[PDB]
Subunit: 148 residues, 3 copies
């Protein structure tokens, strides 16, 4: 009950964009964890389980798309952010499939691992094309950190 912990979820009112929120009944932001500029900030050096899930959805396949989901680590002294976890998905074929009344496709991605972080480190969980995010139902898009 003293361990820094966070489980933030996507703001469902901002379609086509990814904004993390703690103000939801089954979300958490406690024991030192801060959420600033859409990133989770760790309060102390230590081992942390970092995870995130996104759900993508699309109707038809007019475009061949490469979907990515990445959890990164950043500290002021860094040249740039570094990938901690990442995955890619390709829901559609190059050829635009024939026919109207398109059935939607759905693609989830889950990332998660243990990392030694330092006080003040900023963790981000982002997607390359947030226009395909699906957060119509709760529990589909989230980002968490838990001190071990």
């Amino acid at each position: 009950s003293d361990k820094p912990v966070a489980h933030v979820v996507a703001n469902h009112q901002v379609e086509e964009q990814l904004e993390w929120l703690s103000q939801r009944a089954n979300a958490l932001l406690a024991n030192g964890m801060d959420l600033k500029d859409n990133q989770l900030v760790v309060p102390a050096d230590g081992l942390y389980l970092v995870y995130s899930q996104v759900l993508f959805k699309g109707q038809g396949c007019p475009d061949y798309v490469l979907l990515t989901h990445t959890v990164s680590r950043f500290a002021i002294s860094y040249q740039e952010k570094v990938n901690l976890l990442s995955a890619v998905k390709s829901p559609c074929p190059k050829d635009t499939p024939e026919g109207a009344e398109l059935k939607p496709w759905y693609e989830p991605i889950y990332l998660g691992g243990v990392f030694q972080l330092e006080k003040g480190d900023q963790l981000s969980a982002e997607v390359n094309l947030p226009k395909y995010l699906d957060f119509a139902e709760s529990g589909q898009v989230y980002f968490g950190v838990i001190a071990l």
Copy 2:
């Protein structure tokens, strides 16, 4: 060691149904965790890592199918079921066949997050269409809850 812990797996004997079991090699149900009416019950207020994986399999694509996997919380206080984690998958883009070969397809879904739960809360891990679940091998369908 003395923290409530559970890692239950699907019963492989009955097809088209999702029944969690603790009586298997590499399964767990200890330190207060209980399995009742196919749900994991936590023994106390506190932080818990909750996760689950399901594997779906189908013989070709006779028609469009929408697969969902959801971990929900039934709050002993509130008296209602809320989804904590959820994902969707569409394994059948088009009904390709039309006399063609019905090749099997496979689709896994993983869910996991940390949540503040209350004593007596009941957690369920379910899918919408259990007819597509695949238990052929061990380690494919599971549900865990671990006290932090």
Copy 3:
């Protein structure tokens, strides 16, 4: 004492094979965890969170392939591998729909769960077809174990 922990990543310099590395940034192998013969060895009896992710990529679908990812337990009392976690994915059809497709497909698989293990147990995270693994970016392929 301090928790045995490991988070190893795939060697990106060896294409078509899965070699776990620990001497990289954002990788861990400490407090008694050992990496031997590409397997993670636990130093004591206890509960451990074990997880792994792989990312597969292919182009054109000339062969109908079933991709598998499995985390196994090998005991020095039961000299044979047992599945702890496993999943299967089918990224292709027997051959391209018409003529020959040309866009690359991508498929990630995540596995994770808590297990009671014994001192000396060796954990392996392997795929059936490593030729399809993609290490083009950091954080795509990993294997971790952390003592609870």
